[PDB]
Short mmCIF file of C-alpha atoms in Angstrom, two decimals:
data_model
loop_
_atom_site.label_atom_id
_atom_site.label_comp_id
_atom_site.label_asym_id
_atom_site.label_seq_id
_atom_site.Cartn_x
_atom_site.Cartn_y
_atom_site.Cartn_z
CA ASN A 1 11.59 -3.66 -61.15
CA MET A 2 9.94 -7.08 -61.77
CA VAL A 3 12.31 -9.95 -62.68
CA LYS A 4 10.98 -12.77 -64.81
CA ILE A 5 10.84 -16.40 -63.70
CA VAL A 6 11.11 -19.03 -66.44
CA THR A 7 11.00 -22.82 -66.50
CA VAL A 8 13.66 -24.50 -68.64
CA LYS A 9 13.30 -27.98 -70.12
CA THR A 10 16.35 -30.19 -69.72
CA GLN A 11 17.79 -33.65 -70.29
CA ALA A 12 18.84 -35.59 -67.19
CA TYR A 13 22.44 -36.70 -66.70
CA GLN A 14 23.18 -39.92 -64.86
CA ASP A 15 26.49 -39.34 -63.02
CA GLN A 16 25.67 -36.57 -60.51
CA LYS A 17 26.03 -38.75 -57.37
CA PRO A 18 27.70 -36.45 -54.77
CA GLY A 19 29.16 -38.37 -51.81
CA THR A 20 31.07 -37.12 -48.77
CA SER A 21 32.87 -34.38 -50.72
CA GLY A 22 30.23 -32.89 -53.01
CA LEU A 23 30.06 -33.22 -56.77
CA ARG A 24 33.55 -32.88 -58.28
CA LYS A 25 33.79 -33.19 -62.08
CA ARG A 26 36.34 -31.85 -64.58
CA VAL A 27 35.76 -28.26 -65.61
CA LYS A 28 35.63 -29.28 -69.28
CA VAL A 29 32.55 -31.42 -68.61
CA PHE A 30 30.88 -28.39 -66.99
CA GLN A 31 31.59 -26.26 -70.09
CA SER A 32 30.78 -29.08 -72.50
CA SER A 33 27.58 -30.43 -70.90
CA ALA A 34 24.59 -28.12 -71.21
CA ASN A 35 22.76 -27.51 -67.92
CA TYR A 36 25.08 -29.73 -65.88
CA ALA A 37 25.46 -27.06 -63.20
CA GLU A 38 21.77 -26.09 -63.28
CA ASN A 39 20.35 -29.61 -62.98
CA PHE A 40 22.50 -30.20 -59.90
CA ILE A 41 21.79 -26.85 -58.23
CA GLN A 42 18.09 -27.37 -59.01
CA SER A 43 18.37 -30.91 -57.65
CA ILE A 44 19.93 -29.63 -54.43
CA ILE A 45 17.18 -27.04 -53.89
CA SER A 46 14.48 -29.60 -54.72
CA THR A 47 15.35 -31.47 -51.53
CA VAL A 48 13.92 -28.47 -49.63
CA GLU A 49 10.16 -29.01 -49.42
CA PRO A 50 8.51 -25.99 -51.04
CA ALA A 51 6.54 -24.62 -48.07
CA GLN A 52 9.83 -24.16 -46.18
CA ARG A 53 11.70 -22.15 -48.85
CA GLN A 54 10.61 -18.59 -48.01
CA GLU A 55 11.71 -18.85 -44.37
CA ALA A 56 14.85 -20.73 -45.47
CA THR A 57 18.21 -19.20 -46.25
CA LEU A 58 21.24 -20.76 -47.97
CA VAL A 59 24.83 -19.71 -47.31
CA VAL A 60 26.77 -19.90 -50.56
CA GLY A 61 30.54 -19.60 -50.59
CA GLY A 62 33.43 -19.73 -53.00
CA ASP A 63 37.11 -20.56 -53.44
CA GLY A 64 38.26 -17.28 -54.99
CA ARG A 65 39.34 -19.00 -58.22
CA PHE A 66 38.11 -18.75 -61.80
CA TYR A 67 34.41 -19.50 -62.59
CA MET A 68 33.24 -18.99 -59.01
CA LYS A 69 31.53 -15.63 -59.49
CA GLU A 70 29.45 -16.97 -62.40
CA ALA A 71 28.46 -20.11 -60.50
CA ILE A 72 27.38 -17.88 -57.58
CA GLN A 73 25.24 -15.78 -59.90
CA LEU A 74 23.64 -18.98 -61.21
CA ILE A 75 22.87 -20.34 -57.73
CA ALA A 76 21.16 -17.03 -56.98
CA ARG A 77 19.31 -17.10 -60.31
CA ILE A 78 18.00 -20.56 -59.44
CA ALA A 79 17.40 -20.27 -55.69
CA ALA A 80 15.25 -17.18 -56.28
CA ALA A 81 13.07 -18.87 -58.90
CA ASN A 82 12.43 -21.72 -56.49
CA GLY A 83 11.33 -19.34 -53.73
CA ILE A 84 14.32 -19.62 -51.39
CA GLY A 85 13.83 -16.50 -49.31
CA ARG A 86 17.43 -15.48 -48.73
CA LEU A 87 21.01 -16.14 -49.75
CA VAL A 88 23.99 -15.14 -47.65
CA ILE A 89 27.10 -14.70 -49.79
CA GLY A 90 30.53 -13.51 -48.74
CA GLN A 91 31.79 -10.32 -50.36
CA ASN A 92 33.19 -11.05 -53.84
CA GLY A 93 31.96 -14.63 -53.40
CA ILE A 94 34.70 -15.40 -50.84
CA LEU A 95 33.64 -17.72 -48.02
CA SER A 96 35.97 -20.41 -46.73
CA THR A 97 34.50 -23.72 -45.70
CA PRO A 98 34.92 -23.19 -41.93
CA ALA A 99 33.30 -19.81 -42.53
CA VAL A 100 30.29 -21.41 -44.23
CA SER A 101 29.90 -23.97 -41.46
CA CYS A 102 30.23 -21.15 -38.91
CA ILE A 103 27.63 -18.86 -40.46
CA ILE A 104 25.19 -21.71 -41.19
CA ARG A 105 25.04 -22.55 -37.47
CA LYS A 106 25.07 -18.93 -36.18
CA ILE A 107 22.10 -17.75 -38.30
CA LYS A 108 20.27 -21.12 -38.24
CA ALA A 109 20.26 -21.46 -42.00
CA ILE A 110 18.78 -24.39 -43.93
CA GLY A 111 22.20 -25.19 -45.32
CA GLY A 112 24.88 -24.01 -47.66
CA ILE A 113 26.52 -24.45 -51.02
CA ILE A 114 30.32 -24.42 -51.15
CA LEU A 115 32.11 -23.92 -54.45
CA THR A 116 35.70 -25.09 -54.88
CA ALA A 117 38.20 -25.43 -57.72
CA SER A 118 41.64 -26.79 -58.48
CA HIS A 119 44.92 -24.94 -58.78
CA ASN A 120 44.99 -24.35 -62.58
CA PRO A 121 41.50 -25.19 -64.00
CA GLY A 122 42.63 -25.23 -67.65
CA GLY A 123 41.53 -28.98 -63.71
CA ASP A 124 38.15 -29.36 -62.01
CA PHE A 125 35.33 -27.77 -60.03
CA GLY A 126 33.31 -28.84 -56.97
CA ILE A 127 29.77 -28.11 -55.70
CA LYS A 128 29.17 -29.33 -52.14
CA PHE A 129 25.92 -29.12 -50.19
CA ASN A 130 25.90 -28.70 -46.40
CA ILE A 131 22.85 -29.02 -44.19
CA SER A 132 21.36 -27.21 -41.20
CA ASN A 133 24.06 -28.55 -38.88
CA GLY A 134 26.73 -26.87 -41.02
CA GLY A 135 28.38 -30.14 -42.03
CA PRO A 136 28.33 -31.87 -45.38
CA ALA A 137 25.00 -33.46 -46.20
CA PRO A 138 24.92 -37.18 -45.22
CA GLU A 139 24.36 -40.21 -47.48
CA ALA A 140 20.60 -40.16 -46.88
CA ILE A 141 20.37 -36.75 -48.55
CA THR A 142 23.13 -37.10 -51.16
CA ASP A 143 21.17 -40.13 -52.39
CA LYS A 144 18.06 -37.94 -52.76
CA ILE A 145 20.08 -35.34 -54.68
CA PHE A 146 21.28 -38.05 -57.10
CA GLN A 147 17.79 -39.51 -57.44
CA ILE A 148 16.37 -36.11 -58.39
CA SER A 149 19.19 -35.23 -60.75
CA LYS A 150 18.72 -38.52 -62.60
CA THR A 151 15.03 -37.88 -63.44
CA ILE A 152 15.01 -34.05 -63.58
CA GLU A 153 13.10 -32.80 -66.64
CA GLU A 154 13.06 -29.05 -65.85
CA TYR A 155 14.51 -26.36 -63.63
CA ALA A 156 13.46 -22.81 -62.69
CA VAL A 157 15.59 -19.69 -63.11
CA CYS A 158 15.44 -15.91 -62.99
CA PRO A 159 17.53 -15.31 -66.12
CA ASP A 160 17.50 -11.52 -65.68
CA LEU A 161 18.67 -11.51 -62.03
CA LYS A 162 22.16 -10.21 -61.20
CA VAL A 163 23.81 -9.76 -57.79
CA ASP A 164 26.64 -7.31 -57.00
CA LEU A 165 28.74 -9.68 -54.91
CA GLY A 166 31.25 -7.01 -53.89
CA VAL A 167 28.86 -4.57 -52.19
CA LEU A 168 28.05 -5.31 -48.53
CA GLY A 169 24.58 -5.40 -47.04
CA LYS A 170 21.09 -6.38 -48.11
CA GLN A 171 19.78 -6.35 -51.67
CA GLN A 172 16.22 -7.21 -52.55
CA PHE A 173 14.61 -8.52 -55.68
CA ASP A 174 10.97 -8.38 -56.77
CA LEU A 175 10.11 -11.54 -58.69
CA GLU A 176 7.02 -11.60 -60.93
CA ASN A 177 4.09 -13.47 -59.36
CA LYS A 178 5.78 -13.55 -55.92
CA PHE A 179 4.76 -11.49 -52.90
CA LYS A 180 7.82 -11.62 -50.67
CA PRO A 181 10.99 -10.13 -52.20
CA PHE A 182 14.01 -12.32 -52.72
CA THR A 183 16.79 -11.18 -50.40
CA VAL A 184 20.58 -11.47 -50.68
CA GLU A 185 22.82 -10.53 -47.72
CA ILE A 186 26.42 -9.82 -48.74
CA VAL A 187 28.56 -10.32 -45.63
CA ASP A 188 32.17 -9.61 -44.77
CA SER A 189 34.05 -12.77 -45.73
CA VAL A 190 36.07 -12.83 -42.49
CA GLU A 191 33.85 -11.13 -39.89
CA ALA A 192 31.65 -13.92 -38.51
CA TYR A 193 34.56 -16.38 -38.57
CA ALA A 194 36.93 -14.09 -36.64
CA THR A 195 34.21 -13.29 -34.06
CA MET A 196 33.91 -17.03 -33.43
CA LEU A 197 37.69 -17.43 -33.10
CA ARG A 198 37.79 -14.44 -30.76
CA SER A 199 35.35 -16.29 -28.49
CA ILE A 200 37.36 -19.55 -28.60
CA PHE A 201 40.94 -18.37 -28.04
CA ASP A 202 42.59 -15.67 -25.90
CA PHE A 203 43.26 -12.92 -28.44
CA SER A 204 44.85 -10.89 -25.61
CA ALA A 205 47.42 -13.63 -24.97
CA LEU A 206 48.04 -14.10 -28.67
CA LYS A 207 48.53 -10.34 -29.24
CA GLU A 208 51.20 -10.36 -26.53
CA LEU A 209 52.79 -13.43 -28.15
CA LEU A 210 53.20 -11.84 -31.62
CA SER A 211 54.08 -8.21 -30.83
CA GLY A 212 56.97 -6.78 -28.86
CA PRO A 213 60.74 -7.32 -28.88
CA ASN A 214 60.45 -10.71 -27.15
CA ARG A 215 57.76 -11.68 -29.64
CA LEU A 216 57.38 -15.05 -31.34
CA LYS A 217 58.14 -14.93 -35.07
CA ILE A 218 55.82 -16.90 -37.34
CA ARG A 219 55.50 -17.58 -41.08
CA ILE A 220 52.13 -18.74 -42.44
CA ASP A 221 52.00 -19.71 -46.13
CA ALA A 222 48.42 -19.95 -47.36
CA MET A 223 49.56 -21.02 -50.84
CA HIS A 224 47.08 -18.72 -52.61
CA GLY A 225 43.87 -20.35 -51.29
CA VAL A 226 40.75 -19.07 -49.55
CA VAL A 227 42.21 -19.00 -46.05
CA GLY A 228 44.56 -16.19 -47.13
CA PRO A 229 42.32 -13.27 -46.19
CA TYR A 230 41.46 -14.95 -42.88
CA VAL A 231 45.18 -15.23 -42.06
CA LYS A 232 45.99 -11.60 -42.90
CA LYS A 233 42.92 -10.28 -41.06
CA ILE A 234 43.08 -12.44 -37.95
CA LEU A 235 46.83 -13.01 -37.52
CA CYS A 236 48.21 -9.68 -38.74
CA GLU A 237 45.59 -6.92 -38.49
CA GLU A 238 43.92 -8.16 -35.29
CA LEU A 239 46.61 -10.11 -33.43
CA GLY A 240 49.49 -7.89 -34.55
CA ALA A 241 52.02 -10.15 -36.29
CA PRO A 242 54.11 -8.12 -38.76
CA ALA A 243 52.70 -7.96 -42.26
CA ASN A 244 55.56 -10.13 -43.54
CA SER A 245 54.37 -12.92 -41.21
CA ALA A 246 51.51 -14.01 -43.48
CA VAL A 247 52.57 -14.99 -47.01
CA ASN A 248 50.65 -15.72 -50.23
CA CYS A 249 47.40 -14.59 -48.59
CA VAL A 250 45.58 -13.32 -51.71
CA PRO A 251 43.65 -16.05 -53.59
CA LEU A 252 44.75 -16.35 -57.22
CA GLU A 253 42.20 -17.10 -59.94
CA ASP A 254 44.59 -19.47 -61.81
CA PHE A 255 48.12 -20.95 -62.01
CA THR A 256 51.38 -28.57 -55.11
CA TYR A 257 54.35 -28.92 -52.66
CA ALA A 258 55.21 -27.26 -49.31
CA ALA A 259 58.95 -26.78 -49.68
CA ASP A 260 59.03 -22.99 -49.65
CA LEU A 261 58.21 -23.13 -45.94
CA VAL A 262 60.73 -25.90 -45.18
CA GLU A 263 63.54 -23.85 -46.79
CA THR A 264 62.77 -20.60 -44.94
CA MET A 265 62.32 -22.36 -41.61
CA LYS A 266 65.74 -24.01 -42.03
CA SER A 267 67.23 -20.49 -41.95
CA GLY A 268 66.36 -20.04 -38.28
CA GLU A 269 64.57 -16.68 -37.97
CA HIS A 270 61.06 -17.95 -37.27
CA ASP A 271 59.90 -19.91 -34.21
CA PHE A 272 56.79 -21.44 -35.78
CA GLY A 273 55.74 -22.14 -39.36
CA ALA A 274 52.61 -23.38 -41.04
CA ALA A 275 51.73 -24.03 -44.67
CA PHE A 276 48.35 -24.87 -46.24
CA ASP A 277 47.49 -26.26 -49.67
CA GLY A 278 45.13 -24.65 -52.16
CA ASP A 279 42.14 -26.63 -50.90
CA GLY A 280 42.87 -25.76 -47.27
CA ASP A 281 43.09 -29.51 -46.43
CA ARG A 282 46.58 -31.08 -46.30
CA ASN A 283 48.89 -28.89 -44.26
CA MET A 284 52.16 -28.63 -42.42
CA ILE A 285 53.38 -27.35 -39.05
CA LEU A 286 57.11 -26.75 -38.55
CA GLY A 287 59.16 -25.64 -35.55
CA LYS A 288 62.35 -23.67 -35.41
CA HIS A 289 65.04 -24.88 -37.81
CA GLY A 290 62.49 -26.99 -39.67
CA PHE A 291 61.44 -29.31 -36.82
CA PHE A 292 58.53 -31.37 -38.21
CA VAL A 293 55.33 -31.88 -36.21
CA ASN A 294 53.48 -34.98 -37.25
CA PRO A 295 49.69 -34.36 -37.68
CA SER A 296 49.02 -37.33 -35.43
CA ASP A 297 51.27 -35.74 -32.79
CA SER A 298 49.51 -32.33 -32.92
CA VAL A 299 46.21 -33.97 -32.03
CA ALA A 300 47.92 -35.40 -29.00
CA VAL A 301 49.96 -32.35 -28.00
CA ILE A 302 46.82 -30.24 -28.24
CA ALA A 303 44.77 -32.79 -26.31
CA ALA A 304 47.36 -32.90 -23.52
CA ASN A 305 47.40 -29.06 -23.32
CA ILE A 306 43.75 -28.62 -24.20
CA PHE A 307 42.89 -26.33 -21.28
CA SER A 308 45.30 -23.65 -22.47
CA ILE A 309 42.38 -22.75 -24.76
CA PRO A 310 39.49 -20.78 -23.17
CA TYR A 311 36.89 -22.66 -25.19
CA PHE A 312 37.58 -26.04 -23.63
CA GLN A 313 38.40 -24.46 -20.29
CA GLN A 314 34.82 -23.13 -20.32
CA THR A 315 32.88 -25.84 -22.21
CA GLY A 316 34.58 -29.07 -21.20
CA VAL A 317 36.08 -31.87 -23.24
CA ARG A 318 33.09 -34.05 -24.01
CA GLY A 319 35.14 -36.64 -25.86
CA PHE A 320 38.21 -37.50 -27.92
CA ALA A 321 38.23 -39.07 -31.34
CA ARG A 322 40.73 -40.36 -33.88
CA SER A 323 40.49 -41.87 -37.34
CA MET A 324 41.54 -45.51 -37.36
CA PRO A 325 44.77 -44.97 -39.40
CA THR A 326 45.77 -42.00 -37.22
CA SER A 327 48.62 -42.81 -34.80
CA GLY A 328 47.99 -43.85 -31.21
CA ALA A 329 49.56 -40.77 -29.62
CA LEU A 330 46.09 -39.39 -28.78
CA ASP A 331 45.20 -42.74 -27.17
CA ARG A 332 47.99 -42.27 -24.68
CA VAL A 333 46.85 -38.87 -23.44
CA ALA A 334 43.17 -39.90 -23.37
CA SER A 335 44.02 -42.97 -21.35
CA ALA A 336 45.40 -40.73 -18.57
CA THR A 337 42.00 -39.02 -18.31
CA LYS A 338 38.45 -40.26 -17.89
CA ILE A 339 37.53 -38.93 -21.38
CA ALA A 340 36.39 -41.56 -23.84
CA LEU A 341 38.16 -42.04 -27.14
CA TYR A 342 36.43 -43.12 -30.38
CA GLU A 343 38.17 -44.70 -33.38
CA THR A 344 36.24 -43.72 -36.49
CA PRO A 345 36.66 -44.69 -40.13
CA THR A 346 38.39 -42.22 -42.41
CA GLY A 347 35.99 -39.31 -42.81
CA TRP A 348 35.22 -36.05 -41.02
CA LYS A 349 31.49 -36.92 -41.31
CA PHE A 350 32.05 -39.48 -38.56
CA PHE A 351 33.40 -36.87 -36.14
CA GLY A 352 30.43 -34.67 -36.97
CA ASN A 353 27.96 -37.32 -35.79
CA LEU A 354 29.60 -37.72 -32.41
CA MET A 355 29.81 -33.93 -32.10
CA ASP A 356 26.08 -33.72 -32.78
CA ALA A 357 25.42 -36.24 -29.98
CA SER A 358 27.39 -34.05 -27.50
CA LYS A 359 29.99 -36.81 -27.17
CA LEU A 360 33.06 -35.47 -29.01
CA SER A 361 35.01 -32.27 -28.32
CA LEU A 362 38.44 -32.83 -29.95
CA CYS A 363 39.31 -34.97 -32.96
CA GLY A 364 42.20 -35.66 -35.35
CA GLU A 365 43.00 -37.20 -38.75
CA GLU A 366 46.56 -38.13 -39.78
CA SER A 367 46.08 -36.44 -43.11
CA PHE A 368 44.96 -33.09 -41.72
CA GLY A 369 45.49 -32.50 -38.03
CA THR A 370 43.21 -31.37 -35.19
CA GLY A 371 39.61 -30.16 -35.09
CA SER A 372 36.83 -29.49 -32.59
CA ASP A 373 33.04 -29.20 -32.27
CA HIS A 374 33.18 -25.43 -32.79
CA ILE A 375 32.07 -26.16 -36.36
CA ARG A 376 31.37 -29.31 -38.39
CA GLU A 377 34.29 -28.93 -40.82
CA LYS A 378 38.08 -28.90 -40.80
CA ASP A 379 39.72 -25.57 -39.96
CA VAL A 380 43.45 -25.15 -40.62
CA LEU A 381 43.46 -21.69 -39.11
CA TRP A 382 41.80 -23.02 -35.93
CA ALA A 383 44.51 -25.67 -35.72
CA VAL A 384 47.24 -22.99 -36.13
CA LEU A 385 45.70 -20.80 -33.41
CA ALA A 386 45.44 -23.84 -31.10
CA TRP A 387 49.19 -24.41 -31.46
CA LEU A 388 49.88 -20.70 -30.80
CA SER A 389 47.71 -20.69 -27.70
CA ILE A 390 49.83 -23.57 -26.43
CA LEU A 391 53.16 -21.91 -27.22
CA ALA A 392 51.88 -18.87 -25.32
CA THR A 393 51.03 -20.70 -22.11
CA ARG A 394 53.93 -23.18 -22.17
CA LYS A 395 56.44 -20.45 -23.10
CA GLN A 396 58.62 -23.10 -24.77
CA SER A 397 59.73 -23.92 -28.28
CA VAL A 398 57.70 -26.24 -30.50
CA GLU A 399 60.61 -28.70 -30.33
CA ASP A 400 60.79 -28.67 -26.54
CA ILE A 401 57.03 -29.16 -26.27
CA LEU A 402 57.20 -32.27 -28.43
CA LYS A 403 60.25 -33.56 -26.57
CA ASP A 404 58.65 -33.22 -23.16
CA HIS A 405 55.43 -34.76 -24.50
CA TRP A 406 57.25 -37.89 -25.72
CA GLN A 407 59.19 -37.95 -22.46
CA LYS A 408 55.86 -38.20 -20.55
CA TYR A 409 53.75 -40.33 -22.91
CA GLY A 410 56.39 -42.12 -25.02
CA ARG A 411 56.62 -41.58 -28.77
CA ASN A 412 54.45 -42.98 -31.51
CA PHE A 413 56.65 -42.95 -34.57
CA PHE A 414 54.34 -42.68 -37.57
CA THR A 415 54.58 -42.56 -41.35
CA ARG A 416 52.19 -43.17 -44.22
CA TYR A 417 53.24 -44.72 -47.53
CA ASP A 418 51.09 -43.77 -50.53
CA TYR A 419 51.32 -45.90 -53.65
CA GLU A 420 49.48 -44.02 -56.38
CA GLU A 421 48.02 -45.15 -59.69
CA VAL A 422 48.59 -48.85 -58.99
CA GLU A 423 47.38 -51.68 -61.21
CA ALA A 424 43.92 -52.09 -59.70
CA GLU A 425 43.67 -55.82 -60.35
CA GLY A 426 46.84 -56.44 -58.36
CA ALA A 427 45.85 -54.04 -55.59
CA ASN A 428 42.65 -55.91 -54.76
CA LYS A 429 44.54 -59.20 -55.00
CA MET A 430 47.03 -57.86 -52.47
CA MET A 431 44.40 -57.07 -49.87
CA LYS A 432 42.04 -59.96 -50.47
CA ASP A 433 45.09 -62.21 -50.02
CA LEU A 434 46.28 -60.26 -46.98
CA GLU A 435 42.83 -60.57 -45.41
CA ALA A 436 42.78 -64.36 -45.65
CA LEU A 437 46.26 -64.40 -44.09
CA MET A 438 45.06 -62.63 -40.93
CA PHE A 439 41.75 -64.50 -40.63
CA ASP A 440 43.72 -67.78 -40.23
CA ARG A 441 43.67 -69.55 -36.86
CA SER A 442 47.36 -69.47 -35.93
CA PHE A 443 47.85 -65.94 -37.31
CA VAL A 444 47.08 -64.12 -34.05
CA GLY A 445 50.19 -64.38 -31.89
CA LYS A 446 52.60 -65.06 -34.77
CA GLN A 447 55.91 -63.25 -34.32
CA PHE A 448 57.95 -61.01 -36.58
CA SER A 449 61.53 -59.94 -35.97
CA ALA A 450 63.67 -57.39 -37.78
CA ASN A 451 67.03 -56.23 -36.34
CA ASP A 452 66.36 -57.54 -32.81
CA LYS A 453 62.96 -55.87 -32.58
CA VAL A 454 60.23 -58.48 -32.06
CA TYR A 455 56.61 -57.85 -32.97
CA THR A 456 53.89 -60.34 -32.16
CA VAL A 457 50.35 -60.09 -33.49
CA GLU A 458 47.79 -59.25 -30.86
CA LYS A 459 44.83 -58.63 -33.18
CA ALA A 460 44.24 -58.56 -36.93
CA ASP A 461 40.88 -57.53 -38.45
CA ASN A 462 39.27 -55.53 -41.28
CA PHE A 463 37.90 -52.51 -39.45
CA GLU A 464 34.11 -52.20 -39.19
CA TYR A 465 32.21 -49.35 -37.53
CA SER A 466 28.64 -49.03 -36.30
CA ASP A 467 27.81 -45.33 -36.23
CA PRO A 468 26.11 -44.88 -32.83
CA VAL A 469 24.22 -41.84 -34.13
CA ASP A 470 22.93 -42.56 -37.64
CA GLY A 471 22.73 -46.37 -37.17
CA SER A 472 24.70 -47.15 -40.32
CA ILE A 473 27.39 -49.80 -40.58
CA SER A 474 30.68 -49.28 -42.42
CA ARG A 475 32.65 -52.39 -43.43
CA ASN A 476 36.07 -52.93 -44.97
CA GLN A 477 37.59 -49.70 -43.71
CA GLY A 478 41.17 -51.05 -43.74
CA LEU A 479 43.18 -53.96 -42.42
CA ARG A 480 44.92 -53.42 -39.10
CA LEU A 481 47.75 -55.47 -37.71
CA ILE A 482 47.96 -54.53 -34.03
CA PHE A 483 50.94 -55.75 -32.01
CA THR A 484 51.35 -56.23 -28.27
CA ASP A 485 53.84 -53.43 -27.78
CA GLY A 486 51.21 -51.03 -29.07
CA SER A 487 52.46 -50.79 -32.66
CA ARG A 488 50.32 -51.10 -35.76
CA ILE A 489 50.33 -51.65 -39.48
CA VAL A 490 47.27 -50.51 -41.42
CA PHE A 491 46.51 -50.93 -45.12
CA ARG A 492 43.79 -49.11 -47.08
CA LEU A 493 42.65 -48.72 -50.67
CA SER A 494 41.11 -45.49 -51.89
CA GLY A 495 39.24 -43.95 -54.83
CA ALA A 496 41.73 -42.61 -61.72
CA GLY A 497 43.78 -45.73 -61.05
CA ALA A 498 44.03 -47.28 -57.60
CA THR A 499 45.84 -45.91 -54.55
CA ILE A 500 47.31 -47.84 -51.62
CA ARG A 501 47.80 -46.22 -48.24
CA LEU A 502 50.06 -47.95 -45.76
CA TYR A 503 50.26 -46.53 -42.23
CA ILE A 504 52.91 -47.53 -39.74
CA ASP A 505 52.81 -46.65 -36.07
CA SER A 506 55.64 -47.91 -33.83
CA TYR A 507 55.60 -47.09 -30.11
CA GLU A 508 58.91 -46.40 -28.36
CA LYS A 509 59.08 -45.92 -24.57
CA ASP A 510 62.90 -45.94 -24.35
CA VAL A 511 64.20 -42.37 -23.98
CA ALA A 512 67.42 -43.12 -25.86
CA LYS A 513 65.22 -43.74 -28.92
CA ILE A 514 62.57 -41.02 -28.57
CA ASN A 515 64.77 -38.57 -30.49
CA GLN A 516 65.37 -40.51 -33.65
CA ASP A 517 64.63 -40.28 -37.32
CA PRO A 518 61.12 -41.75 -37.75
CA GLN A 519 62.17 -43.42 -40.99
CA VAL A 520 64.91 -45.31 -39.13
CA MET A 521 62.77 -46.37 -36.15
CA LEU A 522 60.00 -47.47 -38.54
CA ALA A 523 62.31 -49.48 -40.89
CA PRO A 524 61.66 -52.76 -39.00
CA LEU A 525 57.87 -52.48 -39.24
CA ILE A 526 58.05 -51.25 -42.86
CA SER A 527 59.92 -54.45 -43.75
CA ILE A 528 57.31 -56.55 -42.01
CA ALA A 529 54.47 -54.74 -43.76
CA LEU A 530 55.95 -55.30 -47.21
CA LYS A 531 56.79 -59.02 -46.73
CA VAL A 532 53.33 -59.87 -45.35
CA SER A 533 51.38 -57.77 -47.83
CA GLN A 534 53.49 -59.09 -50.75
CA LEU A 535 53.02 -55.58 -52.05
CA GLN A 536 55.91 -55.55 -54.55
CA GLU A 537 54.71 -58.72 -56.30
CA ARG A 538 51.11 -57.57 -56.54
CA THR A 539 52.07 -54.06 -57.75
CA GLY A 540 55.59 -53.97 -59.16
CA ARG A 541 56.24 -50.94 -56.94
CA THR A 542 59.59 -50.89 -55.15
CA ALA A 543 59.01 -47.52 -53.39
CA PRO A 544 55.94 -45.58 -52.31
CA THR A 545 54.93 -42.63 -54.44
CA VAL A 546 55.06 -40.37 -51.39
CA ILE A 547 56.28 -40.78 -47.82
CA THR A 548 54.59 -38.64 -45.17
#
């Protein structure tokens, strides 16, 4: 049954520049701008030179939420008309971002499209393009996508073509005036991903950890996002944790905090807790009674126990890496090995480039946690299994693992202050001023005291990074005050109003102070950061918006 191909005239929009995250615009502008979605999808596909489209395949994958199934049908209706040979789509459109990265690299696909949406899109909607390496397309190619979208006059579509996203296996489509049929492979949303995880961790050890009378009781709150089905399938059905272990594991099409987990952990039944947000980005790891594990500490605890995981035990640790605002806990375990450590600007794309050069195995970001080279994307579920592998071999509580880690390496106390929606004029004043402060001659070596704790400036710069892989240079990535005792203050702005991020990292070696409230131990450096920055006078803010 021959499906028509038609060319559709269009007006070009001028604000479809994607960046590190994809295109993310409000849903209302998608519904109220004609051909917004199509121009962009067409612009993505137009980066694929036409002679390489039949032997190419795209992995397309969705959030679960409202609008996704229609945007998948559209991608198909456009990719077919342009002669892309094959789409791989997860059943019902469900494909988490680690899953898309995974499949892209397993089947050697040309790239992928990842759809995303906000909790309650009454609310926005994202379209992100990944490339053959399974990671987000780099600036070189996002600039080409924008260039095309700005001068696009027409796109191609099969307006008659419809795909049954909930039926597994291959479907084929005969397009008029084409010889090869257009193919769509509907794949189990979880299968490929769980096969990868089964090759990385010891599912035998984990099954013995979560079943039995001496088992380890866990609660994983997936907060109604895409990782849900991966948690239920991998952690309950395969590994054997009781069904009540995984919570909120069905993605909801419509409708923010983490306190449900904190309350239930305070009860005392469970030994290990983890909560994710809707996006699958920001996330939390708790121990018994609510013991908090700092994301910067997980990176380090995992690094120091990294061979409890068969993957690294068998592949090696080719390198360690850390985003510049992330705490220096990782630095202390790396410095006891001959593994190099890299300090990258904020951005997972920077880890990806060292991974591609075979020079990075384990990495961490304060705002997310720990990742590896197994994919080119962040994986919360990976990070949860890494922690459970370590509980299984250490046979100790989360709290006792952290305590013995600090006992050996010392403790990096760490917090981040977010000031949101700040008067942008004053924000840039605050940092331009602060910069000139630290570039002054006598500034290095100046001393600061607060409550008989003395800090003296060892180095003060505005972090720059030369990517050793793509050659690019990234300036003004945040201002770092580094002190001789190994403590740090870092300041960043970020793009809706302005947003200030203030990171504080104090190193304590004294054992009588290891086990202390981080907000108390950090109070001296907080005070120093706010005097120097003059943050209250440039912003009016007397408290951060969030403390983390």
